Amino acid sequence: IVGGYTCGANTVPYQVSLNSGYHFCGGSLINSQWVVSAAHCYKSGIQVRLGEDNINVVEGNEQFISASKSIVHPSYNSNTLNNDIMLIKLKSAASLNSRVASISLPTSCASAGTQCLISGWGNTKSSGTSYPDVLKCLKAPILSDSSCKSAYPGQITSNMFCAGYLEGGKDSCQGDSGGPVVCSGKLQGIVSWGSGCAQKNKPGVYTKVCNYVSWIKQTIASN
């Protein structure tokens, strides 16, 4: 997260860190046994870490659980990043309390103009590199599909939306990938891609979760 603020420990309870020896992507807890992330975050050997603030210190509220299975969307295209969404089932259910909570799936798509909360442990600079130890947050609006398509000609599909500031300076970044975009208490997006981070006229591109609700529910109902 470039240009954001320190969230505060456990103030984003559905935020997860995907660890394979080190933090490599974010994700969101959608029920006690399932996590949603970006398909471009896929790897074998994922350990899911819940209840994290400082990912380098054990502070007392963590639950580290291994994944028993991961399911990349059937239509994921790694060249275009269309359908950049994956499901990860945990080996055992997480214990839910006020600091580890699921985030509700959307019942409708959110509109341009809606303000959302984006969070993650990714890079905090647009030029160099500086990864934070504690969770960063950014409030940003969903942009209109026209400006989104204007910023990225021939690249935005109906499964994507832009959120951010055209002026630059505030955006998600590398390391935030797979993380949540929550608007009015519902998971609306997944940190997916963008050109560089926080550049002028290159807002962040997010997977449009409302389009995948049926696929998520039935996949979890059969696995």
83 binds ligand 4CM (CB under 6 A): no
Q: Which stretch binds Ca ion (CB under 5 A): 1-9, 47-55, 71-79, 106-114?
A: 47-55
Q: CB within 8 A of 169, min separation 6: which ones?
A: 2, 3, 126, 198
Altogether, the residues listed in the chain come to a count of 223
What is d(CA 126, CA 100) in angstroms, rounded to the nearest whole number? Answer: 31
Q: Return the one option of Ca ion, ligand 4CM, none that residue 32 interacts with (CB less than 5 to 8 A, by type).
A: none
152 binds ligand 4CM (CB under 6 A): no
> Backbone phi, then psi, for 209, in 5-degree steps?
-55, -35
Strands 47-50 and 63-72: antiparallel
Considering the complex, what minimum distance in angstroms separates the CB of residue 29 from Ca ion? 16
Q: Is 73 a catalytic residue?
A: no
For residue 22, the one-letter residue type is Y
Give the nearer residue to Ca ion in terms of CB position, either 109 or 134: 134
Q: Which residue ranges are tagged as binding site for Ca(2+)?
A: 52, 54, 57, 62
Q: Which stretch binds Ca ion (CB under 5 A): 48-56, 162-170, 190-198, 201-209?
A: 48-56
Considering the complex, what minimum distance in angstroms separates the CB of residue 37 from ligand 4CM? 11
Q: Which residue ranges are tagged as binding site for substrate?
A: 171-172, 174-175, 177
Give the nearer residue to Ca ion in terms of CB position, either 59 or 167: 59
189, HSE (Cβ side, Cα atoms, 13 Å): 32
Of 59-118, binders to Ca ion (CB under 5 A) are: 59
Burial of 189 (0-12, 13-18, 19+ CB in 10 A): buried
Among 28, 102, 177, 192, which one carries the catalytic annotation?
177
Among 17, 28, 84, 102, which one carries the catalytic annotation?
84
Considering the complex, what minimum distance in angstroms separates the CB of residue 81 from ligand 4CM? 7
> Backbone phi, then psi, for 217, in 5-degree steps?
-65, -40
Element (H or E) spanning 222, and its range? helix 213-222
Beta bridge partners of 23: 19
Q: Is 177 a catalytic residue?
A: yes
Give the nearer residue to ligand 4CM in terms of CB position, either 63 or 177: 177
What is d(CA 83, CA 202) in angstroms, rounded to the nearest whole number? Answer: 20
172 binds ligand 4CM (CB under 6 A): yes
Interface residue list for ligand 4CM (CB under 6 A): 40, 171-174, 177, 191, 193-194, 197, 204
Q: Just list the catalytic residues.
A: 40, 84, 177
